[PDB]
Design an enzyme around this catalytic site. Structure first.
Site, mmCIF file in Angstrom:
data_model
loop_
_atom_site.group_PDB
_atom_site.id
_atom_site.type_symbol
_atom_site.label_atom_id
_atom_site.label_comp_id
_atom_site.label_asym_id
_atom_site.label_seq_id
_atom_site.Cartn_x
_atom_site.Cartn_y
_atom_site.Cartn_z
ATOM 1 N N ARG A 54 0.471 -1.335 -0.171
ATOM 2 C CA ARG A 54 0.565 -0.161 0.063
ATOM 3 C C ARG A 54 0.786 1.526 -0.072
ATOM 4 O O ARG A 54 1.437 1.516 1.082
ATOM 5 C CB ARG A 54 -0.939 0.035 1.267
ATOM 6 C CG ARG A 54 -2.148 1.456 1.275
ATOM 7 C CD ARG A 54 -2.783 1.376 1.953
ATOM 8 N NE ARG A 54 -3.713 1.804 2.078
ATOM 9 C CZ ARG A 54 -4.287 2.816 3.130
ATOM 10 N NH1 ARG A 54 -3.250 3.159 4.120
ATOM 11 N NH2 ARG A 54 -5.346 3.650 2.646
ATOM 12 N N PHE A 59 1.807 10.150 1.431
ATOM 13 C CA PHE A 59 1.255 9.493 2.583
ATOM 14 C C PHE A 59 2.367 9.173 3.323
ATOM 15 O O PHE A 59 3.457 9.750 4.277
ATOM 16 C CB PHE A 59 0.235 9.687 2.401
ATOM 17 C CG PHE A 59 -0.691 9.424 3.932
ATOM 18 C CD1 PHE A 59 -0.115 9.571 5.009
ATOM 19 C CD2 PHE A 59 -1.901 8.372 3.514
ATOM 20 C CE1 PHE A 59 -1.038 9.258 5.967
ATOM 21 C CE2 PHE A 59 -2.166 7.392 4.601
ATOM 22 C CZ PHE A 59 -2.073 8.745 6.282
ATOM 23 N N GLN A 62 3.611 1.666 2.678
ATOM 24 C CA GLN A 62 2.965 0.502 3.816
ATOM 25 C C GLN A 62 3.709 -0.854 3.848
ATOM 26 O O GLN A 62 3.138 -1.180 2.779
ATOM 27 C CB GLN A 62 1.654 0.454 4.321
ATOM 28 C CG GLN A 62 1.282 -0.812 5.411
ATOM 29 C CD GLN A 62 -0.160 -0.523 6.043
ATOM 30 O OE1 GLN A 62 -0.480 0.973 5.989
ATOM 31 N NE2 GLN A 62 -0.912 -1.799 6.268
ATOM 32 N N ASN A 101 -1.219 -0.908 13.102
ATOM 33 C CA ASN A 101 -2.360 -1.684 13.645
ATOM 34 C C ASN A 101 -4.076 -1.493 13.475
ATOM 35 O O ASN A 101 -3.935 -1.147 12.406
ATOM 36 C CB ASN A 101 -1.897 -1.746 15.196
ATOM 37 C CG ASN A 101 -1.976 0.478 15.096
ATOM 38 O OD1 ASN A 101 -3.882 0.709 14.978
ATOM 39 N ND2 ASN A 101 -1.440 0.980 15.598
ATOM 40 N N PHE A 112 4.746 1.496 8.131
ATOM 41 C CA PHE A 112 4.453 2.442 7.319
ATOM 42 C C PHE A 112 5.943 3.236 7.414
ATOM 43 O O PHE A 112 6.834 3.483 8.844
ATOM 44 C CB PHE A 112 3.243 2.985 6.419
ATOM 45 C CG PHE A 112 3.029 3.702 8.042
ATOM 46 C CD1 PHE A 112 2.160 3.717 9.661
ATOM 47 C CD2 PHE A 112 2.932 5.073 8.412
ATOM 48 C CE1 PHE A 112 2.089 4.199 10.245
ATOM 49 C CE2 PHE A 112 2.947 5.895 9.420
ATOM 50 C CZ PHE A 112 2.348 5.547 10.431
ATOM 51 N N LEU A 121 -1.913 10.656 13.149
ATOM 52 C CA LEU A 121 -1.647 9.582 13.854
ATOM 53 C C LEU A 121 -0.066 9.640 15.341
ATOM 54 O O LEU A 121 -0.971 8.415 15.581
ATOM 55 C CB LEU A 121 -0.224 8.961 12.635
ATOM 56 C CG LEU A 121 -0.755 9.223 11.672
ATOM 57 C CD1 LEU A 121 0.150 8.216 10.291
ATOM 58 C CD2 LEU A 121 -2.392 8.142 10.820
ATOM 59 N N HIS A 125 -0.076 5.511 16.260
ATOM 60 C CA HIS A 125 0.536 4.593 15.981
ATOM 61 C C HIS A 125 1.859 4.891 16.427
ATOM 62 O O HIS A 125 2.473 6.412 16.633
ATOM 63 C CB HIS A 125 0.609 5.007 14.346
ATOM 64 C CG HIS A 125 -0.370 4.748 13.451
ATOM 65 N ND1 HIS A 125 -0.829 3.254 13.114
ATOM 66 C CD2 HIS A 125 -1.637 5.125 13.767
ATOM 67 C CE1 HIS A 125 -2.784 2.807 12.814
ATOM 68 N NE2 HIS A 125 -2.798 4.263 12.524
#
Length: 164
Positions: A54, A59, A62, A101, A112, A121, A125
């Site tokens: 991903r 951004f 991942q 997660n 990521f 985030l 995370h």
């Protein structure tokens, strides 16, 4: 004293380059040790041969789902998903390495790499490392992503391990 690990990245089987990470074992030892071990493969499983499934430009990238290769799998070295160690480190810009997660205290193996500051985030995370060399390689990887995260070429961790 903080360990350093490397990924050798490939793009449809062709070498792209090496990314190295500093892992903040001084601040998040359980989380850093999970990522360090999975990278060396010393428990018999880990990141070698897995993909970045991903990638969303601007951004993050991942990866780490070495069991189902699509975001549904992965496992930690502890025999179960493990707790959020702390949130001392914040998502302060490109190169930040952070745990994926499925909600509180569900860390496995997926992680990521931020390619932009992701303040929202923080507290959700666990940040545990940062890119040390090869941010340009992460930027090259980013260009194979898309708005919905699907990659246009297969991005793989062809080799990985511990440096120094």
């Amino acid at each position: 004293v903080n360990p350093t690990v490397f990924f050798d990245i490939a793009v449809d089987g062709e070498p792209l380059g090496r990314v190295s990470f500093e892992l903040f074992a001084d601040k998040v030892p359980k989380t850093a040790e999970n990522f360090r071990a999975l990278s060396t493969g010393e428990k018999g499983f880990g990141y070698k041969g897995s993909c970045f499934h991903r990638i969303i430009p601007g951004f993050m990238c991942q990866g780490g789902d070495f069991t189902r290769h699509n975001g549904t799998g992965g496992k930690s070295i502890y025999g179960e998903k493990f707790e959020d160690e702390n949130f001392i480190l914040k998502h302060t810009g490109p190169g930040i390495l952070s745990m994926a997660n499925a909600g509180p205290n569900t860390n496995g193996s997926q992680f990521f790499i931020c390619t932009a500051k992701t303040e929202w985030l923080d507290g959700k995370h666990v940040v545990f490392g940062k890119v040390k060399e090869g941010m340009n390689i992460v930027e090259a990887m980013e260009r194979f992503g898309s708005r919905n995260g699907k990659t246009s070429k297969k991005i793989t961790i062809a080799d990985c391990g511990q440096l120094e």
